[PDB]
């Protein structure tokens, strides 16, 4: 079986969904954690300094 | 390189864990204050998935249903006594002090009141030899003279299910089934058949170990493979 086109057919699982906190389609319904804002993981909002260039 | 199989083990992942949720009971001795007036009737004889030997279901005088390690010859209806002045019958639990010398014993305790540590596998037994006011010398199944406290409880008789090791597995499938019930990753790929990155014995154009197999005791995990601190190797000499 090829890792390409024939392995794409099995992809019917729902993981990333609309988040209650930030509104982005990043709430992993199996992990109960948001990959965008960190909802489910932290009380604080997920922000990182590398999301922008060092001197910006 | 990459961490070896023995290192992946300690992480305690699903593959390396024992199917605990499928295990029946943690076979320990009953906690009596003093006296002897604790006896029970054997209701059933069950199979223990954890040790492949049989386990006896007993109901006590005070109405306690608990599984106990089954010795040889113990059946349904039989009465077993637990306590200090218990009857010296096969299947009864009483401290090593009360048990006479030259009598085969099983489920021996290390520290008095722990519930039994030694001689628990199929058909094995510990031999009680010397008596004192201080020490009770018990000869464990390995042939080692273990000096124990006389207050350590023990069940009389050999463990049931003897001679299991006598008949071969014959086929790989039978091993498969046995191993699916234990805390062991199976099958075993030889290190010599792996890549250099994966094991100290991996690599080469032909399959042979790199350095000698006898490794030092002080070797770090990742290097401690082959013959660990071997006093000698081989059959001859």
């Amino acid at each position: 079986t090829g890792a390409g086109t024939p392995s794409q057919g099995k992809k019917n699982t729902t993981t990333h969904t609309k988040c209650r906190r930030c509104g982005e389609k990043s709430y992993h319904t199996k992990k109960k954690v948001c990959s965008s804002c960190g909802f489910g993981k932290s009380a604080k909002r997920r922000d990182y300094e590398w999301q922008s260039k060092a001197g910006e | 390189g990459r961490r070896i199989q023995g290192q992946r083990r300690g992480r305690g992942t699903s593959t390396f864990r024992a199917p605990s949720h499928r295990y029946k009971a943690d076979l320990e001795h009953r906690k009596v204050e003093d006296g002897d007036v604790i006896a029970g009737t054997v209701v059933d004889i069950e199979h223990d998935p954890a040790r492949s030997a049989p386990v006896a279901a007993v109901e006590f005088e005070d109405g306690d249903r608990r599984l106990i390690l089954a010795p040889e010859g113990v059946g349904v209806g039989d009465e077993l006594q637990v306590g200090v002045s218990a009857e010296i019958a096969p299947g009864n639990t009483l401290p090593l002090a009360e048990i006479p010398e030259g009598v085969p014993v099983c489920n021996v305790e290390s520290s008095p009141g722990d519930g039994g540590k030694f001689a628990r596998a199929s058909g094995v037994n510990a031999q009680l030899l010397t008596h004192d006011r201080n020490v009770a010398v018990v000869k464990l199944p390995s042939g080692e003279m273990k000096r124990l406290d006389p207050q350590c409880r023990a069940t009389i008789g050999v463990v049931a299910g003897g001679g299991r090791t006598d008949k071969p597995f014959v086929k790989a499938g039978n091993k498969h089934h046995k191993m699916k019930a234990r805390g062991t990753k199976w099958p075993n790929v030889r290190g010599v058949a792996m890549n250099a990155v994966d094991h100290p014995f991996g690599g080469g154009g032909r399959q042979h170990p790199g350095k000698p197999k006898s490794i030092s005791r002080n070797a770090p995990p990742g290097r401690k493979v082959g013959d660990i601190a071997s006093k000698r190797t081989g059959r001859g000499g």
């Binding site: - | 040889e72 085969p104 003897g162 001679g163 008949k167």
Partner: protein, 73 residues
């Protein structure tokens, strides 16, 4: 008694199973009566079809040479 193994496995693999299964499905004496009705139930578990006596013994033998040593003392 290992004809289910076919032309595979070898002598010792089917000889040590033949001596084990011929002395297992055999008529052995019971501790409660004088009947030879002792049959196997599983690994180490034995039972007599007479007085419903379900007991413990060896894995393939109802009595091991080590279990008979306890009877002495």
């Amino acid at each position: 008694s290992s004809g289910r193994f076919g032309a595979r496995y070898g002598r010792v693999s089917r000889r040590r199973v033949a001596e084990i299964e011929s002395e297992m499905n055999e008529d052995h004496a019971c501790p409660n009566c004088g009947e030879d009705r002792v049959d196997r139930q599983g690994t180490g578990i034995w039972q007599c079809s007479y007085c419903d006596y379900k007991f413990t013994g060896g894995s393939y033998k109802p009595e091991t040479p080590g279990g008979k040593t306890v009877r002495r003392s």
